[PDB]
PDB file of C-alpha atoms and ligand atoms in Angstrom:
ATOM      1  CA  UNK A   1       0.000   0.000   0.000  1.00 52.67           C
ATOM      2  CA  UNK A   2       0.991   3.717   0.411  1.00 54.11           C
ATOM      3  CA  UNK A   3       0.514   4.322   4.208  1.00 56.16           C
ATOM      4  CA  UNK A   4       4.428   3.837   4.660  1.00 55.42           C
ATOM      5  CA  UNK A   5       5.523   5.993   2.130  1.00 56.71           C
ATOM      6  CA  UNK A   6       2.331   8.945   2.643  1.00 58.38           C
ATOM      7  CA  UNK A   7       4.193   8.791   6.218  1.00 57.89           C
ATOM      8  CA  UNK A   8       7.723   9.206   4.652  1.00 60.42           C
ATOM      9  CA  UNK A   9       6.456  12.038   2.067  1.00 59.53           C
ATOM     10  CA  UNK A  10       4.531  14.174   4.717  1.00 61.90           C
ATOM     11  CA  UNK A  11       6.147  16.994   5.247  1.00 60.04           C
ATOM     12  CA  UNK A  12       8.927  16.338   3.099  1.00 60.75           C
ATOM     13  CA  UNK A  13      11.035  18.596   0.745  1.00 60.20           C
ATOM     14  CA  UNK A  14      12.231  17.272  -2.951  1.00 60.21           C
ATOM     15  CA  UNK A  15      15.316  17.860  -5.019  1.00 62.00           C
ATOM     16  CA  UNK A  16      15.804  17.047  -8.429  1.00 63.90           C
ATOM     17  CA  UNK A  17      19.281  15.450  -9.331  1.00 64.95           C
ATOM     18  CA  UNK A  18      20.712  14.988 -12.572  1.00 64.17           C
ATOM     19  CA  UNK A  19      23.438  12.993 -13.087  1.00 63.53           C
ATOM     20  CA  UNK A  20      25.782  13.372 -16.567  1.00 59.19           C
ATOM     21  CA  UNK A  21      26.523   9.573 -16.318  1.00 56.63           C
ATOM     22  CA  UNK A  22      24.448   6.109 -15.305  1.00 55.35           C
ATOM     23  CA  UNK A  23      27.402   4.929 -13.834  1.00 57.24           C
ATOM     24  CA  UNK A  24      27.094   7.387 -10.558  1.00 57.65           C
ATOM     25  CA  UNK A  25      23.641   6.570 -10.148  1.00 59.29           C
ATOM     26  CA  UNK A  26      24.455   2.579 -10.495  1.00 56.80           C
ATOM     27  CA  UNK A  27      27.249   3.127  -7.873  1.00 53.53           C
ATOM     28  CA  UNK A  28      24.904   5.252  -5.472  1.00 50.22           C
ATOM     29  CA  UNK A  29      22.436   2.945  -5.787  1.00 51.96           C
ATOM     30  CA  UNK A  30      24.723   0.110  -4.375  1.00 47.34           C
ATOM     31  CA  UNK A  31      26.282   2.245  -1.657  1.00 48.55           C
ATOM     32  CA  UNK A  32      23.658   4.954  -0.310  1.00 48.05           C
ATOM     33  CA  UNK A  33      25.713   7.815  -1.154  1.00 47.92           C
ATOM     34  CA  UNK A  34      25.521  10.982  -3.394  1.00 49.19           C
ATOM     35  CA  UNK A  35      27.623  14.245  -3.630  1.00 45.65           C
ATOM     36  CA  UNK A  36      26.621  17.224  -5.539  1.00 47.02           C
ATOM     37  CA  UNK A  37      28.230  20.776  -6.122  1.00 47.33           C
ATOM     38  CA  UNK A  38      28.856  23.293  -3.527  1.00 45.13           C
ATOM     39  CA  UNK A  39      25.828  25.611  -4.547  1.00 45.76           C
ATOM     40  CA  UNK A  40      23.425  22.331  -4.012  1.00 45.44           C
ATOM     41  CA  UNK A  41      25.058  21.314  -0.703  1.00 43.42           C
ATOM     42  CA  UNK A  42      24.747  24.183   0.901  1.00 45.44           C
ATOM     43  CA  UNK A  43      20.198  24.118  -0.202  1.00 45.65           C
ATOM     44  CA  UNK A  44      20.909  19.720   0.969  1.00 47.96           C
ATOM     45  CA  UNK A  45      21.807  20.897   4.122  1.00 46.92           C
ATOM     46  CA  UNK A  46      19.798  23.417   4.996  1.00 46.41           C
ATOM     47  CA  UNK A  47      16.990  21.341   3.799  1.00 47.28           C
ATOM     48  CA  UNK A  48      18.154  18.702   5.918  1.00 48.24           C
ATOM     49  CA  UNK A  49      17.484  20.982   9.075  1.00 49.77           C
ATOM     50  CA  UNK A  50      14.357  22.632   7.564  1.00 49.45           C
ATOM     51  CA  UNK A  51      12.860  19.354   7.016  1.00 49.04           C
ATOM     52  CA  UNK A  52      11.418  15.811   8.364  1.00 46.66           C
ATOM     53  CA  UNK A  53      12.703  13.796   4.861  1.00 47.18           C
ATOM     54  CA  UNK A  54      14.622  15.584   2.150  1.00 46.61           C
ATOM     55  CA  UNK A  55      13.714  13.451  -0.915  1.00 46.16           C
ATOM     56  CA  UNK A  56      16.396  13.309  -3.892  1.00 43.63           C
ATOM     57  CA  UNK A  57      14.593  12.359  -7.332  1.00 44.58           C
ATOM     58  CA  UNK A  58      17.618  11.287  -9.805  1.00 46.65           C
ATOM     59  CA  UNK A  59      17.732  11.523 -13.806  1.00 46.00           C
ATOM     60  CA  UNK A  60      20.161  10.917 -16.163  1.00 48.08           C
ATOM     61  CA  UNK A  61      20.681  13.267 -18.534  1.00 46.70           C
ATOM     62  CA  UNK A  62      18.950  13.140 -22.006  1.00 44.94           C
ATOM     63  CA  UNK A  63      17.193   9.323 -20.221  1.00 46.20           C
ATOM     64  CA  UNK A  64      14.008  10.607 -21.015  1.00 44.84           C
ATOM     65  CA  UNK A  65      13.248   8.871 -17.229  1.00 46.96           C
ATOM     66  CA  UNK A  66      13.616   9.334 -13.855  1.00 44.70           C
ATOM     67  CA  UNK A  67      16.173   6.256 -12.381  1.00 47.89           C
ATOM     68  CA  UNK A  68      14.340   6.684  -8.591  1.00 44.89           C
ATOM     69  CA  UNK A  69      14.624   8.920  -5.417  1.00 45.96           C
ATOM     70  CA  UNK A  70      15.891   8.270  -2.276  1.00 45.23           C
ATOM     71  CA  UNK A  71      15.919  10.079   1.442  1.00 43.55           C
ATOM     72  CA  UNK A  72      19.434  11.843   2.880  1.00 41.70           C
ATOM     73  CA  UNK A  73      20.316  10.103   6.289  1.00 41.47           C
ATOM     74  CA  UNK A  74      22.829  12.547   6.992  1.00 43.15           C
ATOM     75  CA  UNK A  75      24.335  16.068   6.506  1.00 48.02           C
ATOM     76  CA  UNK A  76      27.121  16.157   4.002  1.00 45.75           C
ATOM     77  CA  UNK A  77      30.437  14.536   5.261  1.00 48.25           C
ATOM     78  CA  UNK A  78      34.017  15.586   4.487  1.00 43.30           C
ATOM     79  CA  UNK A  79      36.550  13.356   5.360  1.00 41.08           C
ATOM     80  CA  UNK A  80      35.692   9.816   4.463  1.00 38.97           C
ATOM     81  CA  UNK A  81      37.052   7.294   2.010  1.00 39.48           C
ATOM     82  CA  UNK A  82      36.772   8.263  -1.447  1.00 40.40           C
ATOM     83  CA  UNK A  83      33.986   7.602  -2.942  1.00 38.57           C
ATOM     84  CA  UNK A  84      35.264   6.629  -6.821  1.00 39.82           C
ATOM     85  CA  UNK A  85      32.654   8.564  -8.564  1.00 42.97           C
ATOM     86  CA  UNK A  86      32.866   8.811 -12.024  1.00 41.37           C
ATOM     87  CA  UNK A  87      33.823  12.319 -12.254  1.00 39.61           C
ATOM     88  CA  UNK A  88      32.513  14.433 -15.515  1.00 39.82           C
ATOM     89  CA  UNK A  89      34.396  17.135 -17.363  1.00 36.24           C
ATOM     90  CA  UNK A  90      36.661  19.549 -15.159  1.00 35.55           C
ATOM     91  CA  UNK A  91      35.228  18.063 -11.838  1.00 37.02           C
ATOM     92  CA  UNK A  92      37.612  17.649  -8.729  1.00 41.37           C
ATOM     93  CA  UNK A  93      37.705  14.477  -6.002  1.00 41.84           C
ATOM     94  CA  UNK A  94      36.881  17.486  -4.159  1.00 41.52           C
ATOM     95  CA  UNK A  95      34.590  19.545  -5.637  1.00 42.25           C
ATOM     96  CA  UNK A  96      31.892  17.215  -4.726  1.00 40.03           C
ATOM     97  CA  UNK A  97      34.024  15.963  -1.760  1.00 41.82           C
ATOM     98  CA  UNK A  98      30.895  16.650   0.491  1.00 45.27           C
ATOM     99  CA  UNK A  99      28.980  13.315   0.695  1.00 46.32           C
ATOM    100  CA  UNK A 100      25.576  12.511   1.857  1.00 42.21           C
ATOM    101  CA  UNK A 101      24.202   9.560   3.175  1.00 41.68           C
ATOM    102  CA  UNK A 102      21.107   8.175   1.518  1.00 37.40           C
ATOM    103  CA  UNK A 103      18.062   5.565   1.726  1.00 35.47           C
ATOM    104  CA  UNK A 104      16.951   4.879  -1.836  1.00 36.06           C
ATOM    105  CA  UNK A 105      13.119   4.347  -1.272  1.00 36.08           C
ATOM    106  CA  UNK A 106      12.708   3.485  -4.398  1.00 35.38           C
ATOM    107  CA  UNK A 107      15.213   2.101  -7.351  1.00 35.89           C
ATOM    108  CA  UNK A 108      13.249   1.916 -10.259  1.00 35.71           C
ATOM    109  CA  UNK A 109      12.729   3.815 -13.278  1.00 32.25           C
ATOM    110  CA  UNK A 110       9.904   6.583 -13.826  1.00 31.08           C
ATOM    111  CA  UNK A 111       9.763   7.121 -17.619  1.00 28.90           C
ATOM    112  CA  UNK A 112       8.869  10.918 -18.242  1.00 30.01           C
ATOM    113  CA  UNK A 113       5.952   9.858 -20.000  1.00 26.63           C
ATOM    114  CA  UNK A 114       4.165   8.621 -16.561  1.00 27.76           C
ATOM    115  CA  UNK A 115       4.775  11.830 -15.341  1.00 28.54           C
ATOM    116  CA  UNK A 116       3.668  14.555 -18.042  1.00 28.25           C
ATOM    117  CA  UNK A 117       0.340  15.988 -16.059  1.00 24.68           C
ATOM    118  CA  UNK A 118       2.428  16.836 -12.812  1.00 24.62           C
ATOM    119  CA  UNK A 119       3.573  20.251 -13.147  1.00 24.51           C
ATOM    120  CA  UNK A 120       5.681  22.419 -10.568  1.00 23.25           C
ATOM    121  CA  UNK A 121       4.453  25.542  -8.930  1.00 24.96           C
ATOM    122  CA  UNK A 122       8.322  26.277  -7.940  1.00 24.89           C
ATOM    123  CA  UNK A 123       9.068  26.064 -11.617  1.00 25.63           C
ATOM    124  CA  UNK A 124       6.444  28.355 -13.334  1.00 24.17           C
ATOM    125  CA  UNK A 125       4.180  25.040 -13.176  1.00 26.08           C
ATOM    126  CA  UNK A 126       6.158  24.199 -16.024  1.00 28.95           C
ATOM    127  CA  UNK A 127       6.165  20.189 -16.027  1.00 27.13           C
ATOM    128  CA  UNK A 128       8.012  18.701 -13.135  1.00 30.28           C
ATOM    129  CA  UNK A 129      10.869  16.709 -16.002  1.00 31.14           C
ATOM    130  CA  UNK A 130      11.941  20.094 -16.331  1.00 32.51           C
ATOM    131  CA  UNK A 131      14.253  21.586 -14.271  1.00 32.58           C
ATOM    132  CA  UNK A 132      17.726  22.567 -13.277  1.00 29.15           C
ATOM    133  CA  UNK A 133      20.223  20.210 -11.511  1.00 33.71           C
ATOM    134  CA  UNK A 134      18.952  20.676  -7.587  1.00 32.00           C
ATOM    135  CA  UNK A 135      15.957  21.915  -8.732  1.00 35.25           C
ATOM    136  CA  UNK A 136      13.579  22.261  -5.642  1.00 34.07           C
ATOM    137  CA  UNK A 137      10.484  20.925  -6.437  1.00 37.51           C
ATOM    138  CA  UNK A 138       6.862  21.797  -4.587  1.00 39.07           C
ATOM    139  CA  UNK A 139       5.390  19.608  -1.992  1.00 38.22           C
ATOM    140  CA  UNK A 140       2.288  18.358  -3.220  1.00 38.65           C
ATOM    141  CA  UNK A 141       3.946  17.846  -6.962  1.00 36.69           C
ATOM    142  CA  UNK A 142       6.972  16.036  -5.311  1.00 38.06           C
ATOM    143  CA  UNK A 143       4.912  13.813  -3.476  1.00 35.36           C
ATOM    144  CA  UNK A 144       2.729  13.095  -6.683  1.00 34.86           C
ATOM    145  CA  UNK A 145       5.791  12.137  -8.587  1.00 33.42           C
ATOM    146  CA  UNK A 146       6.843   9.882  -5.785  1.00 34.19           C
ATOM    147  CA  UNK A 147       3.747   7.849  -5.378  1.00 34.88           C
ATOM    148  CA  UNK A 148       3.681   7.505  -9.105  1.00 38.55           C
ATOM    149  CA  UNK A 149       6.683   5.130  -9.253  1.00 40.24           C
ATOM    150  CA  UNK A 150       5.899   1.334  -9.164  1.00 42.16           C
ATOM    151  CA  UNK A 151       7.038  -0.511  -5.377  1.00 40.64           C
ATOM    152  CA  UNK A 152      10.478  -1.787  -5.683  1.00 39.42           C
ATOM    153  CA  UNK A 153      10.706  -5.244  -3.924  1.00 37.52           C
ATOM    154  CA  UNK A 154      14.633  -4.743  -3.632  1.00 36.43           C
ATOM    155  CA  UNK A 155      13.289  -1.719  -0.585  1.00 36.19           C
ATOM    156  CA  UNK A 156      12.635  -1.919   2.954  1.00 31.27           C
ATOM    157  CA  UNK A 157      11.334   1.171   4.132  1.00 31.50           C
ATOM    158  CA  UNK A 158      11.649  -0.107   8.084  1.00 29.60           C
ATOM    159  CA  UNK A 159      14.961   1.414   8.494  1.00 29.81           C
ATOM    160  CA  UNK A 160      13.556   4.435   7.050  1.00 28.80           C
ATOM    161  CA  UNK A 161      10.754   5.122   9.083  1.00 27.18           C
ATOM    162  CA  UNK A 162      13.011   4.359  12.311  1.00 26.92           C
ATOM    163  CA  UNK A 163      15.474   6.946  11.154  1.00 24.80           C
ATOM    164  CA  UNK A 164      13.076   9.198  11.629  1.00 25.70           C
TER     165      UNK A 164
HETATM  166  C1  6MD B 201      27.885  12.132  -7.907  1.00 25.53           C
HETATM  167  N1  6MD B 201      27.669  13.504  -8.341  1.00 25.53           N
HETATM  168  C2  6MD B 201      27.381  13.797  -9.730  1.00 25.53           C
HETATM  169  N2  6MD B 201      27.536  12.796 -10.579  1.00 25.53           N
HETATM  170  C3  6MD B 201      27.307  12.980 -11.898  1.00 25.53           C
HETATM  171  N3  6MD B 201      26.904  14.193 -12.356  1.00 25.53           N
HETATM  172  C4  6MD B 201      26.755  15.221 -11.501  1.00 25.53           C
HETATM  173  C5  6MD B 201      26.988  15.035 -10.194  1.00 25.53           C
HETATM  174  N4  6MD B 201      26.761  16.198  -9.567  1.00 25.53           N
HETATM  175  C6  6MD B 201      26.393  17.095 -10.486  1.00 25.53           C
HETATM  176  N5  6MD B 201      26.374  16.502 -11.684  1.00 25.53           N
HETATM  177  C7  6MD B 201      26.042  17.140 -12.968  1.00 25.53           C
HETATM  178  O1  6MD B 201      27.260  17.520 -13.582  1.00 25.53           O
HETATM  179  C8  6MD B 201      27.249  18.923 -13.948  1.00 25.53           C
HETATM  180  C9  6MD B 201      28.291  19.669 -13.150  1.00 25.53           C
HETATM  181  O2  6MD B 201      29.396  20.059 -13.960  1.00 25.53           O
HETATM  182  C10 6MD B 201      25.823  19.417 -13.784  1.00 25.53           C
HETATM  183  O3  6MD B 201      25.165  19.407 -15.049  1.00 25.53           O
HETATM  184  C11 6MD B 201      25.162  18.394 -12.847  1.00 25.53           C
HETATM  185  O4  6MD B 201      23.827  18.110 -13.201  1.00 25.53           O
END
């Protein structure tokens, strides 16, 4: 049902990610982590304060879909191990040195077509595909464009909803 992830979603604030490459999103995927540039971090984490879940919905650029979203865990984190991210044209091991913990709650894809009546008020309710990297995206259409993904089997939202 949706009870567990309505519960998740309330009160939640949404980011959209785009990644350059699938092979960042594959690794994230595996390890709960994600990094993004210093003008997102400093939104993540403030976010992460402002809010009770701070929901990241990933695409890949020119996909056409959305690969899934996932909850930060943490504040970004300097200081770590590496993590070997595929890094894209004139990007430093530390210019997206800051790394957040994450929960994917959901790993599957969303193809933009699923998602073409859901428009963003925080956009100029242009539709909610569109949008800049860290693109913050309104609560009601976030939460649409979460429920509309299918359940991923591979998720167990229990250490989720204890997090919180
Ligand atoms: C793991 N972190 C990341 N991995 C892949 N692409 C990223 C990324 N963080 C930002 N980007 C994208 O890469 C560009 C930054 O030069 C922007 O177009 C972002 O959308």
């Amino acid at each position: 049902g949706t009870s567990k992830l309505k519960y998740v979603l309330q009160d939640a604030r949404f980011f959209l990610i785009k990644s350059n490459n699938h092979e960042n999103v594959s690794l994230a995927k595996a390890k709960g982590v994600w990094s993004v540039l210093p003008v997102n971090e400093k939104k993540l984490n403030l976010a992460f304060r402002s809010a009770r879940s701070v929901i990241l919905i990933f695409s890949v650029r020119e996909s056409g879909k959305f690969q899934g979203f996932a909850r930060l865990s943490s504040e970004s984190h300097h200081g770590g191990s590496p993590i070997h991210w595929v890094l894209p044209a004139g990007m430093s091991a530390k210019m997206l040195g800051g790394v957040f913990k994450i929960d994917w709650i959901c790993r599957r894809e969303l193809p933009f077509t699923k998602s073409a009546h859901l428009t963003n008020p925080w956009n100029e309710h242009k539709p909610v595909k569109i949008g800049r990297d860290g693109q913050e995206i309104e609560l009601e259409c976030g939460t649409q464009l979460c429920l509309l993904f299918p359940p991923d089997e591979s998720i167990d939202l229990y250490q989720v909803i204890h997090k919180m």
